[PDB]
Amino acid sequence: MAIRVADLLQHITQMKRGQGYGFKEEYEALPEGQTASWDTAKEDENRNKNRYGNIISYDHSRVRLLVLDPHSDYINANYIDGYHRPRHYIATQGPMQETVKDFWRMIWQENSASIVMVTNLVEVGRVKCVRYWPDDTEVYGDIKVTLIETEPLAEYVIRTFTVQKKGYHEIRELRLFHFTSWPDHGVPCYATGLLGFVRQVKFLNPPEAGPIVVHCSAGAGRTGCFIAIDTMLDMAENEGVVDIFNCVRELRAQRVNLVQTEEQYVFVHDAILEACLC
């Protein structure tokens, strides 16, 4: 069911014409809600580690933390396969006050070099994510994080840090790619800025490092869009085809409801098309 890149404009058009099979039906065919077990996530002892009760971590794909407390192994995060590479990303919720330390522990544990943040901290008066990075230097658990560079651009900001587990000698470099123009449950007016942002991550992420951590507020909608676009550009570049429906289907098998609205699903298509034209 793959679509030739050469045929993508025609496909998207046909899919936007209300007259035959289109995006509403296609989106409605994606599996909605829970499709696999999440027994650990729904443990009483882990309720306060989950931001949204409906978007919690499937057992098969969940990122397990070293146990410190038998329930210390839980974070609301899942490995997500990329095009080339299994466990290429971790999709997770935006940290909560309670989970900031767990978040940095996962980063250390997993050898992650990149964080992709596709939310603002507050949106229309609602907290979406707690600030989990320092203005200067801060210790989260025993993870010491120091800001070394800020690069502001029009629709996003890249912040670079050193990261060190206290009492050990390794000092790592990490980048936080923070996209600032994408509203929760919404989509950007244009794909262009987001595509530049994607291009930066692909350019700068060290491929020898651990998974790229991707998060929004719940870790489904905008997180899923970023992952879908990123993956499909790899597929397009390599095969001259994209299969966005099975991509998002596969995304949902690994973590519930990634790409959370029809408008987002359509936006993923528009963004991939633009990248392919360019």
Residue numbers in the entry: 889 to 956, 959 to 1168
Paper text:
Protein tyrosine phosphatases (PTPs) play a critical role in regulating cellular functions by selectively dephosphorylating their substrates. The ∼280 residue PTP catalytic domain consists of an α/β structure, and biochemical and structural studies have led to a detailed understanding of the catalytic mechanism (Barford et al., 1994; Zhang, 2002). Key features of the domain include the PTP signature motif, the mobile Trp-Pro-Asp “WPD” loop that in the closed conformation positions the conserved and catalytically important aspartate residue, and the phosphotyrosine recognition loop. Here we report the crystal structures of 22 PTP domains, including two tandem-domain RPTP structures and a detailed structural comparison of this protein family.
In the fourth category, both the gateway and secondary pocket are blocked and the inaccessible binding cavity harbors an aromatic residue or a proline in position of Arg24. The second-site loop assumes a twisted conformation in these phosphatases. This architecture is present in the subgroups NT5 (PTPH1, MEG1), NT6 (PTPD1, PTPD2), R1 (CD45), R2B (RPTPμ, RPTPκ, RPTPρ), and R4 (RPTPα, RPTPɛ). In contrast R1 group members (e.g., CD45) and R2B group had a more than two orders of magnitude lower enzymatic activity, suggesting that enhancement of activity by tight association with substrates in signaling complexes may be important for efficient signaling.
